[PDB]
Amino acid sequence: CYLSETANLGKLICIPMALRAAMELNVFQLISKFGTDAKVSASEIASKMPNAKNNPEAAMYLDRILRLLGASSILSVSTEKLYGLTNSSCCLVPRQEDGVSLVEELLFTSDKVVVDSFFKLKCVVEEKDSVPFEVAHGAKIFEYAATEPRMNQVFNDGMAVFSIVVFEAVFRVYDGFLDMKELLDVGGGIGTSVSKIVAKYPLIRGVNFDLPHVISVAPQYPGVEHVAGDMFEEVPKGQNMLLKWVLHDWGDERCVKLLKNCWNSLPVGGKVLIIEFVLPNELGNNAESFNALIPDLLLMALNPGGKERTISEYDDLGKAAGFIKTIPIPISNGLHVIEFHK
Amino acid sequence: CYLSETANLGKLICIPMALRAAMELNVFQLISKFGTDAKVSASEIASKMPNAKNNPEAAMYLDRILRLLGASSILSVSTTAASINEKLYGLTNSSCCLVPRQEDGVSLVEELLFTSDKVVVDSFFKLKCVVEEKDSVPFEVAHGAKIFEYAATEPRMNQVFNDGMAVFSIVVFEAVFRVYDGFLDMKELLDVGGGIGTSVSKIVAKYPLIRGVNFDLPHVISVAPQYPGVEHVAGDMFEEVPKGQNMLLKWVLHDWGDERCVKLLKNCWNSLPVGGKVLIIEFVLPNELGNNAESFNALIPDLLLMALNPGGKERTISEYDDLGKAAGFIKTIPIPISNGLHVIEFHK
Ligand SMILES: Nc1ncnc2c1ncn2[C@@H]1O[C@H](CSCC[C@H](N)C(=O)O)[C@@H](O)[C@H]1O
Ligand SMILES: Nc1ncnc2c1ncn2[C@@H]1O[C@H](CSCC[C@H](N)C(=O)O)[C@@H](O)[C@H]1O
Ligand SMILES: COc1cc2c(cc1O)[C@@H]1Cc3ccc(OC)c(O)c3CN1CC2
Ligand SMILES: COc1cc2c(cc1O)[C@@H]1Cc3ccc(OC)c(O)c3CN1CC2
């Protein structure tokens, strides 16, 4: 049965690298500009690639990429074959309104800096206190970002664009921003998250807090103030705080130190909102499971102590930091807002 | 449904790199050694890894790799009454193919470590270049040399590639020998681009009257094992092929474009006697692609060779016939073996 399983196992590396090429060639957007329901040939797609205009062989090469994605349910195939979008590939078309899609976050998670870290993944099992990213690059990820402007941009934009589709889901379910007057986004990246909160809740004075190397490249957003610092040393005073995709980067002791910094900088009656994909109690072949397992594997490779957590585990961190009423609010497919009250 | 599709699309880079780590940690063999239908925890598996013995956290990290492979159906996941009143992992049909056999250590491990090796993945990072730039080859963009020239300067990649081909060759020839009877009457077989000689060593073991000759590049021949009944020959198949009564081309035509394939096949024709044949062994591109092993068995190397070598591609039966016909061969005989693998005989 070797030669049945050669297909099942040997496709695993090929599919993501074919997807990355298709994203870099803007294939999904090019299909969409014929119409979202269009079914178009490799040569019709290539005709919209100015870089391919002197390459007679472009379409045949492109067809070889696309037919693999068609066999892998990323594109529809119909009888030169014609390719169309699927539910998955519609999420790779920059929206006509604002350019948002999953492309930036998927370009980050399959970036060479990440894949080179995954090549050292076995180190975390064999060697005490080793970090695959460190073994691969000779510095930790946030130190690396400070010296590597390309990686800094890919990572920051991955987080920022992904943040937009996350907050659209949050705002459909969660109303806890109403009546806030000030929000501090702790480890807020380039400030996109707090920009979207202020757009929905125009009375909030938004403050975005991150490392110098991130704040110095952040765009100016209406109703957002940027502040640079180090959240483990101290956090600015704020009436309310957000920690999105921060606690999952760090081990328990670092999380408790950060959360105690937050507690000291909140007023009586203030809250910190944790937004994370929560690890469910039973894992299976479903979105809730993979939405947690994907960043669980990435953080195991990328940063010391990083991991995904259950509701009980987030509650234990907040209680160790002095917070007293944990309120977990499911949003979508494992994404939660977890309120910690001071 | 962005937050459904995050799971479907985001898992695609994660699964292969988790699998690679589990193969490097010999997880599948370790589970196999607990016996038939074994179901073992991460801590039990880690207990069998001497490198992990001073790492209290090793089992918890290993569990994070194994649970993703369980969610992906590469491992089976279960528990016990005792533990309800850490999950346990067992092998599946796919992961059984990642356990080195007791008798000779054969599995799909070596070929899967090659196709996910950094030299391959780095070539895949430049895949877009084939579409954009006339005559660009992703491997050459990534490494500043073509793959066979690179292998002569990089002994680690040479070993990973040569062992990936050789161990896969054993698996493939076991399938060939169950179906194909055309070696039976042969007295001599020259393996053109035969790698380190493993293929022709297995043909001679099965058919001891066959005098076996392995032919490949100098940097492959220099590391090839001494095999019973196999003479090694170094050279360049595009310049001159040794005389042989019969020839094999396995996983060679698919590395090259049409003009290079015709040149090589004309060199084979000239070195064959009247009544000689060349056997082509390839995963043949089906006339109609689907969602089946035969289709993926051709699409996998099709994508690999697009990244790794100029002109390399998988071909249909008609396209192979056309190459043989252009080189002077007659009577193409396509013989299906298994899941798209064929022997195609070209007769002089
Ligand atoms: N010591 C520190 N102080 C402040 N920010 C830090 C930090 N260490 C890491 N960070 C920031 O933590 C962030 C984690 S990634 C998540 C960013 C953003 N909250 C989002 O959800 O999109 C990065 O922007 C990183 O630069
Ligand atoms: N010019 C040339 N002359 C001889 N061998 C060549 C060559 N160019 C490439 N090769 C060889 O072609 C082989 C392709 S890989 C397949 C190897 C083997 N036939 C198998 O099926 O396992 C490699 O071993 C490679 O070194
Ligand atoms: C479901 O799919 C995904 C989910 C998530 C991420 C990427 C995915 O593809 C990213 C990956 C990632 C990597 C590094 C980080 O800091 C070093 C980080 O905060 C995040 C955030 N998470 C959020 C959750
Ligand atoms: C179905 O899965 C697979 C099928 C095949 C290969 C690898 C797979 O995983 C390898 C990949 C490969 C890469 C480069 C080569 O020369 C440069 C080459 O001859 C081969 C051989 N083919 C045989 C078919």
Tab-separated table of N, CA and C in Angstrom, chain A residues 2-7 9-14 16-17 19-21 24-25 49 51-52 55 58 61 64-65 67-68 71-72 87-88 91-92 95 102 106 109-112 115-116 118-119 121-122 124-126 128 162 165 169 279 282-285 287 290-291 293-294 296-297 300 306-307 333, chain B residues 2-7 9-14 16-17 19-21 24-25 51-52 54-55 58 61 64-65 67-68 71-72 87 93-94 97-98 101 106 108 112 115-118 124-125 127-128 130-134 168 171 175 285 289 293 296-297 299-300 302-303 306 312-313 338-339:
chain	number	residue	atom	x	y	z
A	2	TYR	N	2.222	1.070	-0.073
A	2	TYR	CA	3.128	2.232	-0.201
A	2	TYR	C	2.597	3.175	-1.274
A	3	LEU	N	2.220	2.656	-2.440
A	3	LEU	CA	1.962	3.564	-3.582
A	3	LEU	C	0.544	4.180	-3.542
A	4	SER	N	-0.274	3.871	-2.544
A	4	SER	CA	-1.504	4.670	-2.272
A	4	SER	C	-1.123	5.802	-1.317
A	5	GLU	N	-0.265	5.462	-0.365
A	5	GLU	CA	0.059	6.471	0.676
A	5	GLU	C	1.114	7.461	0.164
A	6	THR	N	1.837	7.167	-0.925
A	6	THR	CA	2.786	8.165	-1.465
A	6	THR	C	2.015	9.429	-1.873
A	7	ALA	N	0.775	9.294	-2.323
A	7	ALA	CA	-0.031	10.464	-2.739
A	7	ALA	C	-0.444	11.272	-1.499
A	9	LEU	N	0.773	11.378	1.548
A	9	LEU	CA	1.869	12.011	2.318
A	9	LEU	C	2.669	12.974	1.460
A	10	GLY	N	2.881	12.678	0.184
A	10	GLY	CA	3.814	13.480	-0.614
A	10	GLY	C	3.202	14.795	-1.027
A	11	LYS	N	1.877	14.893	-0.988
A	11	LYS	CA	1.241	16.188	-1.341
A	11	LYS	C	1.401	17.217	-0.230
A	12	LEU	N	1.727	16.795	0.989
A	12	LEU	CA	1.637	17.706	2.168
A	12	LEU	C	2.555	18.925	2.005
A	13	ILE	N	3.773	18.745	1.527
A	13	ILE	CA	4.689	19.905	1.349
A	13	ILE	C	4.252	20.687	0.107
A	14	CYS	N	3.724	19.997	-0.900
A	14	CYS	CA	3.516	20.641	-2.215
A	14	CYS	C	2.379	21.659	-2.140
A	16	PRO	N	1.010	23.715	0.235
A	16	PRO	CA	1.237	25.055	0.750
A	16	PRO	C	2.180	25.885	-0.110
A	17	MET	N	3.164	25.230	-0.723
A	17	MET	CA	4.124	25.982	-1.568
A	17	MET	C	3.448	26.400	-2.892
A	19	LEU	N	0.193	27.029	-3.011
A	19	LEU	CA	-0.705	28.125	-2.570
A	19	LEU	C	0.092	29.429	-2.449
A	20	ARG	N	1.256	29.404	-1.804
A	20	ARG	CA	2.064	30.611	-1.632
A	20	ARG	C	2.369	31.219	-3.007
A	21	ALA	N	2.775	30.401	-3.980
A	21	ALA	CA	3.088	30.924	-5.337
A	21	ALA	C	1.847	31.603	-5.934
A	24	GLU	N	1.331	34.955	-4.270
A	24	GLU	CA	2.376	35.906	-4.733
A	24	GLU	C	2.120	36.357	-6.174
A	25	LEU	N	1.493	35.525	-6.990
A	25	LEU	CA	1.147	35.860	-8.393
A	25	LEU	C	-0.230	36.538	-8.475
A	49	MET	N	-1.109	39.335	-16.067
A	49	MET	CA	0.189	39.409	-15.342
A	49	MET	C	1.204	40.115	-16.246
A	51	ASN	N	4.161	40.894	-15.845
A	51	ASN	CA	5.511	40.316	-15.696
A	51	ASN	C	5.638	39.077	-16.596
A	52	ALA	N	4.524	38.429	-16.980
A	52	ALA	CA	4.529	37.217	-17.819
A	52	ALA	C	4.376	37.544	-19.319
A	55	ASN	N	6.755	35.843	-21.820
A	55	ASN	CA	7.050	34.454	-21.440
A	55	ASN	C	5.976	33.578	-22.057
A	58	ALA	N	4.474	30.925	-19.775
A	58	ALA	CA	3.924	31.308	-18.451
A	58	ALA	C	2.660	30.522	-18.151
A	61	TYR	N	3.094	26.827	-17.193
A	61	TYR	CA	3.644	26.688	-15.828
A	61	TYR	C	2.550	27.013	-14.826
A	64	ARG	N	0.151	24.232	-14.220
A	64	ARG	CA	0.697	23.140	-13.397
A	64	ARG	C	0.542	23.473	-11.905
A	65	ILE	N	0.627	24.758	-11.517
A	65	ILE	CA	0.400	25.182	-10.108
A	65	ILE	C	-1.102	25.034	-9.849
A	67	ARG	N	-3.578	23.379	-11.229
A	67	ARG	CA	-4.270	22.097	-11.277
A	67	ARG	C	-4.050	21.359	-9.954
A	68	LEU	N	-2.931	21.596	-9.288
A	68	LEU	CA	-2.706	20.995	-7.943
A	68	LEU	C	-3.699	21.643	-6.951
A	71	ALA	N	-7.090	20.191	-7.513
A	71	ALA	CA	-7.213	18.833	-6.957
A	71	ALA	C	-7.303	18.894	-5.419
A	72	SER	N	-6.959	20.012	-4.803
A	72	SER	CA	-6.872	20.179	-3.329
A	72	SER	C	-8.004	21.050	-2.781
A	87	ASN	N	-15.126	28.580	-1.647
A	87	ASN	CA	-15.269	29.283	-0.349
A	87	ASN	C	-13.906	29.628	0.255
A	88	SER	N	-12.922	28.725	0.179
A	88	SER	CA	-11.569	28.976	0.748
A	88	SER	C	-10.885	30.078	-0.048
A	91	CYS	N	-11.478	33.857	0.317
A	91	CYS	CA	-10.839	34.476	1.515
A	91	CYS	C	-9.425	34.926	1.175
A	92	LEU	N	-8.992	34.724	-0.066
A	92	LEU	CA	-7.650	35.145	-0.555
A	92	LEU	C	-7.803	36.257	-1.587
A	95	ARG	N	-10.411	42.413	-0.559
A	95	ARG	CA	-11.806	42.850	-0.756
A	95	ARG	C	-11.789	44.112	-1.607
A	102	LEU	N	-7.127	37.028	3.919
A	102	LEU	CA	-6.191	36.202	4.701
A	102	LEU	C	-4.793	36.198	4.070
A	106	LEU	N	-1.347	34.547	5.918
A	106	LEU	CA	-0.833	33.272	5.348
A	106	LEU	C	0.552	33.455	4.740
A	109	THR	N	2.753	33.172	7.845
A	109	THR	CA	2.901	31.853	8.485
A	109	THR	C	3.682	30.872	7.605
A	110	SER	N	3.798	31.155	6.304
A	110	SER	CA	4.594	30.310	5.394
A	110	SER	C	5.856	31.086	4.992
A	111	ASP	N	6.204	32.187	5.687
A	111	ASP	CA	7.433	32.966	5.371
A	111	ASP	C	8.671	32.096	5.665
A	112	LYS	N	9.755	32.332	4.946
A	112	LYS	CA	11.026	31.628	5.145
A	112	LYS	C	11.448	31.722	6.616
A	115	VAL	N	9.331	29.099	8.292
A	115	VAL	CA	9.630	27.726	7.831
A	115	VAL	C	11.032	27.334	8.301
A	116	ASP	N	11.973	28.263	8.330
A	116	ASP	CA	13.324	27.917	8.798
A	116	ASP	C	13.256	27.555	10.294
A	118	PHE	N	10.610	26.141	11.728
A	118	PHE	CA	9.996	24.775	11.746
A	118	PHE	C	11.027	23.714	11.383
A	119	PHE	N	12.013	24.013	10.547
A	119	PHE	CA	13.101	23.043	10.276
A	119	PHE	C	13.859	22.689	11.560
A	121	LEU	N	12.252	22.425	14.559
A	121	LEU	CA	11.206	22.120	15.553
A	121	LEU	C	11.636	20.995	16.513
A	122	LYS	N	12.295	19.927	16.031
A	122	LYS	CA	12.672	18.766	16.872
A	122	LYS	C	13.526	19.223	18.070
A	124	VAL	N	13.038	21.442	20.191
A	124	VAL	CA	12.260	21.833	21.388
A	124	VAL	C	11.952	20.563	22.173
A	125	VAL	N	11.881	19.436	21.490
A	125	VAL	CA	11.687	18.134	22.182
A	125	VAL	C	12.989	17.618	22.777
A	126	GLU	N	14.098	17.732	22.064
A	126	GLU	CA	15.358	17.086	22.506
A	126	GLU	C	16.127	17.919	23.544
A	128	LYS	N	16.469	20.915	26.343
A	128	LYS	CA	15.861	21.785	27.367
A	128	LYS	C	16.056	23.256	26.960
A	162	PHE	N	-5.160	40.466	9.454
A	162	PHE	CA	-5.900	39.439	10.186
A	162	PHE	C	-6.738	40.067	11.317
A	165	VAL	N	-10.343	41.221	10.109
A	165	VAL	CA	-11.461	40.242	9.975
A	165	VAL	C	-11.814	39.692	11.358
A	169	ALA	N	-15.718	40.026	13.330
A	169	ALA	CA	-16.421	38.923	14.019
A	169	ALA	C	-16.738	39.350	15.436
A	279	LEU	N	-8.089	26.866	23.057
A	279	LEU	CA	-7.940	25.429	22.802
A	279	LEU	C	-9.187	24.737	23.345
A	282	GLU	N	-11.908	18.947	23.498
A	282	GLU	CA	-11.694	17.776	22.602
A	282	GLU	C	-11.260	18.333	21.242
A	283	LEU	N	-10.156	17.834	20.713
A	283	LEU	CA	-9.651	18.214	19.385
A	283	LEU	C	-10.176	17.255	18.346
A	284	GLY	N	-10.519	17.804	17.201
A	284	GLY	CA	-10.859	17.017	16.016
A	284	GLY	C	-10.592	17.762	14.735
A	285	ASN	N	-11.124	17.224	13.652
A	285	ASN	CA	-10.872	17.762	12.303
A	285	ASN	C	-11.929	18.855	12.095
A	287	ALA	N	-12.733	23.508	12.551
A	287	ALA	CA	-12.148	24.847	12.539
A	287	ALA	C	-11.725	25.265	13.959
A	290	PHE	N	-8.356	23.426	14.744
A	290	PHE	CA	-7.217	23.886	13.963
A	290	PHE	C	-6.952	25.349	14.211
A	291	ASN	N	-7.968	26.154	14.499
A	291	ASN	CA	-7.682	27.599	14.748
A	291	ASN	C	-6.770	27.769	15.979
A	293	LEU	N	-4.701	24.931	17.066
A	293	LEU	CA	-3.497	24.079	16.883
A	293	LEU	C	-2.478	24.776	15.978
A	294	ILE	N	-2.966	25.515	14.977
A	294	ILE	CA	-2.088	26.247	14.041
A	294	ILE	C	-1.198	27.219	14.819
A	296	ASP	N	-0.663	27.276	17.973
A	296	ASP	CA	0.034	26.497	19.017
A	296	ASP	C	1.354	25.974	18.440
A	297	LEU	N	1.319	25.438	17.225
A	297	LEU	CA	2.549	24.910	16.582
A	297	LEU	C	3.476	26.070	16.235
A	300	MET	N	5.121	27.390	19.362
A	300	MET	CA	6.128	26.445	19.850
A	300	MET	C	7.462	26.635	19.109
A	306	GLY	N	5.535	30.179	24.439
A	306	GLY	CA	4.275	30.459	23.719
A	306	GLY	C	3.458	29.195	23.503
A	307	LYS	N	2.145	29.319	23.667
A	307	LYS	CA	1.236	28.192	23.535
A	307	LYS	C	-0.198	28.677	23.609
A	333	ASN	N	-15.730	30.158	16.039
A	333	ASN	CA	-14.754	29.120	15.634
A	333	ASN	C	-13.542	29.134	16.588
B	2	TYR	N	-14.334	33.942	7.045
B	2	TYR	CA	-12.888	34.050	7.246
B	2	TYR	C	-12.416	33.085	8.349
B	3	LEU	N	-13.124	32.979	9.464
B	3	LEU	CA	-12.630	32.223	10.626
B	3	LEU	C	-12.969	30.726	10.541
B	4	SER	N	-13.593	30.250	9.458
B	4	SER	CA	-13.515	28.804	9.047
B	4	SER	C	-12.258	28.599	8.207
B	5	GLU	N	-12.060	29.518	7.292
B	5	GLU	CA	-11.008	29.328	6.273
B	5	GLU	C	-9.631	29.531	6.879
B	6	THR	N	-9.528	30.253	7.986
B	6	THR	CA	-8.237	30.358	8.668
B	6	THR	C	-7.730	28.940	8.974
B	7	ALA	N	-8.609	28.030	9.404
B	7	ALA	CA	-8.214	26.664	9.793
B	7	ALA	C	-7.810	25.880	8.529
B	9	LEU	N	-6.839	26.777	5.573
B	9	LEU	CA	-5.682	27.272	4.797
B	9	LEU	C	-4.437	27.360	5.700
B	10	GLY	N	-4.606	27.758	6.965
B	10	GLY	CA	-3.458	27.931	7.848
B	10	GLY	C	-2.814	26.636	8.227
B	11	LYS	N	-3.546	25.527	8.176
B	11	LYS	CA	-2.938	24.235	8.591
B	11	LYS	C	-1.991	23.697	7.517
B	12	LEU	N	-2.076	24.213	6.298
B	12	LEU	CA	-1.371	23.576	5.152
B	12	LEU	C	0.155	23.660	5.322
B	13	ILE	N	0.745	24.752	5.837
B	13	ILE	CA	2.216	24.715	6.071
B	13	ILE	C	2.550	23.902	7.334
B	14	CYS	N	1.655	23.929	8.328
B	14	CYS	CA	1.913	23.316	9.633
B	14	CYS	C	2.022	21.800	9.544
B	16	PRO	N	2.941	19.462	7.162
B	16	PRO	CA	4.195	18.848	6.713
B	16	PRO	C	5.377	19.094	7.621
B	17	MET	N	5.437	20.261	8.245
B	17	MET	CA	6.598	20.559	9.091
B	17	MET	C	6.437	19.797	10.404
B	19	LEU	N	4.959	16.839	10.496
B	19	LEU	CA	5.297	15.463	10.072
B	19	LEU	C	6.815	15.300	10.000
B	20	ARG	N	7.507	16.267	9.399
B	20	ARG	CA	8.972	16.188	9.254
B	20	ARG	C	9.596	16.028	10.640
B	21	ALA	N	9.179	16.842	11.600
B	21	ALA	CA	9.718	16.772	12.980
B	21	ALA	C	9.455	15.384	13.572
B	24	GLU	N	11.877	12.955	12.033
B	24	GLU	CA	13.236	13.168	12.584
B	24	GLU	C	13.369	12.626	14.000
B	25	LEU	N	12.292	12.657	14.762
B	25	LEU	CA	12.254	12.186	16.173
B	25	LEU	C	11.944	10.678	16.196
B	51	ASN	N	17.774	11.346	23.692
B	51	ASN	CA	18.171	12.774	23.599
B	51	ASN	C	17.279	13.633	24.506
B	52	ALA	N	16.061	13.166	24.818
B	52	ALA	CA	15.047	13.912	25.590
B	52	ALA	C	15.186	13.641	27.084
B	54	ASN	N	16.890	14.433	29.706
B	54	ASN	CA	17.099	15.521	30.700
B	54	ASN	C	16.224	16.736	30.404
B	55	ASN	N	15.119	16.527	29.702
B	55	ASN	CA	14.182	17.606	29.310
B	55	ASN	C	12.812	17.251	29.884
B	58	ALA	N	9.839	17.658	27.505
B	58	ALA	CA	9.905	17.070	26.147
B	58	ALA	C	8.558	16.475	25.775
B	61	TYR	N	5.915	19.104	24.743
B	61	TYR	CA	6.161	19.657	23.403
B	61	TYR	C	5.851	18.605	22.357
B	64	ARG	N	2.259	18.361	21.531
B	64	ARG	CA	1.727	19.467	20.703
B	64	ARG	C	1.941	19.144	19.220
B	65	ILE	N	3.027	18.466	18.880
B	65	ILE	CA	3.246	17.995	17.484
B	65	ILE	C	2.253	16.859	17.201
B	67	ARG	N	-0.664	15.905	18.520
B	67	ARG	CA	-2.106	16.198	18.488
B	67	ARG	C	-2.458	16.833	17.160
B	68	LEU	N	-1.581	17.602	16.537
B	68	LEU	CA	-1.899	18.167	15.199
B	68	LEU	C	-1.951	17.032	14.171
B	71	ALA	N	-5.226	15.275	14.706
B	71	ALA	CA	-6.371	16.039	14.165
B	71	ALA	C	-6.431	15.852	12.637
B	72	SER	N	-5.273	15.658	12.010
B	72	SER	CA	-5.043	15.513	10.559
B	72	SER	C	-5.238	14.074	10.097
B	87	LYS	N	-3.606	12.202	25.712
B	87	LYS	CA	-4.251	11.221	24.815
B	87	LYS	C	-3.224	10.195	24.336
B	93	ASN	N	-3.065	3.696	8.399
B	93	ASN	CA	-2.500	3.255	7.090
B	93	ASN	C	-1.394	4.187	6.582
B	94	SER	N	-1.535	5.505	6.685
B	94	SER	CA	-0.495	6.441	6.174
B	94	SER	C	0.764	6.352	7.045
B	97	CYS	N	3.464	3.590	6.688
B	97	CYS	CA	4.450	3.757	5.587
B	97	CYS	C	5.660	4.593	6.042
B	98	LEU	N	5.681	5.053	7.308
B	98	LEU	CA	6.784	5.862	7.869
B	98	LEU	C	7.523	5.052	8.933
B	101	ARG	N	11.060	-0.783	7.889
B	101	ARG	CA	10.777	-2.238	8.017
B	101	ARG	C	11.829	-2.905	8.899
B	106	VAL	N	13.440	-0.106	5.103
B	106	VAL	CA	12.725	0.597	3.999
B	106	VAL	C	11.405	1.212	4.480
B	108	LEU	N	8.791	5.126	3.365
B	108	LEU	CA	8.741	6.395	2.614
B	108	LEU	C	9.512	7.510	3.325
B	112	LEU	N	10.373	11.332	1.625
B	112	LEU	CA	9.630	12.469	2.234
B	112	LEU	C	10.596	13.452	2.909
B	115	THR	N	11.842	15.482	-0.131
B	115	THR	CA	10.906	16.425	-0.779
B	115	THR	C	10.524	17.571	0.163
B	116	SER	N	10.816	17.440	1.461
B	116	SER	CA	10.659	18.548	2.429
B	116	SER	C	12.019	19.049	2.901
B	117	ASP	N	13.126	18.669	2.250
B	117	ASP	CA	14.452	19.200	2.636
B	117	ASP	C	14.505	20.708	2.347
B	118	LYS	N	15.336	21.423	3.113
B	118	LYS	CA	15.507	22.878	2.920
B	118	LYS	C	15.924	23.198	1.471
B	124	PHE	N	11.103	25.957	-3.772
B	124	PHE	CA	9.657	26.254	-3.806
B	124	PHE	C	9.417	27.713	-3.429
B	125	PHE	N	10.258	28.336	-2.564
B	125	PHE	CA	10.080	29.768	-2.255
B	125	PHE	C	10.257	30.615	-3.521
B	127	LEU	N	9.175	29.539	-6.617
B	127	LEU	CA	8.314	28.892	-7.632
B	127	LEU	C	7.688	29.912	-8.583
B	128	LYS	N	7.327	31.076	-8.082
B	128	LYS	CA	6.623	32.091	-8.889
B	128	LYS	C	7.501	32.511	-10.071
B	130	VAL	N	9.032	30.839	-12.322
B	130	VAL	CA	8.815	30.107	-13.591
B	130	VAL	C	7.711	30.778	-14.372
B	131	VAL	N	6.767	31.401	-13.689
B	131	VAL	CA	5.624	32.014	-14.393
B	131	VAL	C	6.075	33.351	-14.918
B	132	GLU	N	6.813	34.104	-14.100
B	132	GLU	CA	7.145	35.506	-14.431
B	132	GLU	C	8.272	35.587	-15.465
B	133	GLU	N	9.329	34.794	-15.332
B	133	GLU	CA	10.600	35.022	-16.063
B	133	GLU	C	10.872	33.855	-17.000
B	134	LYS	N	11.012	34.179	-18.280
B	134	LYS	CA	11.395	33.241	-19.347
B	134	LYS	C	12.646	32.505	-18.871
B	168	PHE	N	13.078	4.821	-1.998
B	168	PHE	CA	11.807	4.835	-2.779
B	168	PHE	C	11.893	3.763	-3.885
B	171	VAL	N	10.812	0.248	-2.823
B	171	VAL	CA	9.330	0.168	-2.711
B	171	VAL	C	8.745	-0.003	-4.102
B	175	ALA	N	6.710	-3.455	-6.178
B	175	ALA	CA	5.437	-3.371	-6.919
B	175	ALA	C	5.639	-3.847	-8.362
B	285	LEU	N	1.107	10.753	-15.945
B	285	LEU	CA	0.005	11.714	-15.779
B	285	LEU	C	-1.238	11.089	-16.390
B	289	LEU	N	-7.306	14.216	-14.948
B	289	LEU	CA	-6.960	14.323	-13.522
B	289	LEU	C	-8.243	14.275	-12.711
B	293	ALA	N	-5.183	8.662	-6.070
B	293	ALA	CA	-3.737	8.410	-5.849
B	293	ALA	C	-3.006	8.520	-7.182
B	296	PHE	N	-2.544	12.289	-7.915
B	296	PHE	CA	-1.588	12.976	-7.016
B	296	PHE	C	-0.202	12.381	-7.199
B	297	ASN	N	-0.100	11.081	-7.458
B	297	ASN	CA	1.236	10.474	-7.635
B	297	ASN	C	1.969	11.126	-8.815
B	299	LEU	N	0.972	14.510	-9.889
B	299	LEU	CA	1.025	15.973	-9.624
B	299	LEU	C	2.154	16.302	-8.648
B	300	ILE	N	2.427	15.440	-7.668
B	300	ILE	CA	3.520	15.708	-6.677
B	300	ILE	C	4.845	15.916	-7.406
B	302	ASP	N	5.337	16.390	-10.512
B	302	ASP	CA	5.196	17.468	-11.519
B	302	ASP	C	5.562	18.809	-10.882
B	303	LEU	N	5.063	19.059	-9.676
B	303	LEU	CA	5.339	20.351	-9.025
B	303	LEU	C	6.800	20.398	-8.584
B	306	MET	N	9.026	21.010	-11.590
B	306	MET	CA	8.896	22.404	-12.077
B	306	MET	C	9.836	23.298	-11.268
B	312	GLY	N	11.607	19.831	-16.580
B	312	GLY	CA	11.098	18.632	-15.917
B	312	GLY	C	9.589	18.710	-15.749
B	313	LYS	N	8.915	17.605	-16.051
B	313	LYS	CA	7.430	17.549	-15.966
B	313	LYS	C	6.976	16.104	-16.071
B	338	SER	N	0.887	0.160	-10.612
B	338	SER	CA	0.144	0.494	-9.380
B	338	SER	C	-0.052	2.007	-9.325
B	339	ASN	N	-1.288	2.456	-9.149
B	339	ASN	CA	-1.556	3.855	-8.780
B	339	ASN	C	-0.785	4.825	-9.700
